[PDB]
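Submission checklist for the structure archive. All mandatory fields must be present; incomplete records are returned to the submitter.

[x] Identifier: Virulence sensor protein bvgS
[x] Organism: Bordetella pertussis
[x] Residue count: 233
[x] Sequence attached
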Amino acid sequence: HPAYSAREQQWMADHPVVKVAVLNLFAPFTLFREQFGGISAAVLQLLQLRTGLDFEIIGVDTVEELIAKLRSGEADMAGALEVNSARESFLSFSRPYVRNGMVIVTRQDPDAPVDADHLDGRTVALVRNSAAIPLLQRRYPQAKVVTADNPSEAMLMVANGQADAVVETQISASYYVNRYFAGKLRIASALDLPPAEIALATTRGQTELMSILNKALYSISNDELASIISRWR
C-alpha cells in the first residue's frame, strides 16, 4: 500500500533505524517482560513491514521524560501516547490506532449497584495528566479527583480503600482487573466521556517521519488491529 514521497524516501535512506520512546509501565499498551511487549509493540512491528524501518526502543517511566527525549532528539517518536489537546503545542500525534471508551472500576460486591457512576461526592483516582481529568470534573462538579503514577497504582488505590472508583480505558481496566485484581475490582459501568485515543507522537517539526507513520498506519486495517487488541482482554 503506502505511497511514500521522494522527501520521505530520502528521510528513510538517512534514518534506517528510528528511535522510539515508550512508557515502561503503560500495559497493555507498552511494557517490558526484558523484551518490549504490549498492543503497541505488535503495532510497531506491523509498521516495520509497512515502512522498512528498524525501530530502536527506549523505555522510560514517565511521560515528562518521554517528551524530554523527543525534544532533545534522543528519541525520534513515541510508540504510544494518549492524544491530549494540552500537549499539541509541543507534540504532533499520528492518526490514532486505538480509540476506546472510558469506564469506572470499583471494588467487587455481590451487588452490582445502579449508582456506581454517582461520582459527585466521591473520591475518583486517575493516572496523572490523564486527558480525562478536566472533562471528568466538568461533569461530576462535586467529584473529588486524585492522581496516580500509572494504571496499576491507580487500580491499587481503589483495591486499598484510598478511592471509591478509578477511571480508565475499557482496554486497560479489563486488563488490570482480569489479571492483577480478579475478585477485588470490577468494571462497574461505562462513562459518557469521549473515548481515549492512543497514537504515535513526534515533535511538531518532524514532517517526514510523521507523514510516513500516518501513511503506514492508514494501511493497517481495523481487523489487523482487532486481532492484536483482542489478545489483551
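[x] Structure attached
Curator remark: The first strand starts at residue 17 and ends at 23. DSSP finds eight helices and 14 strands in the chain.
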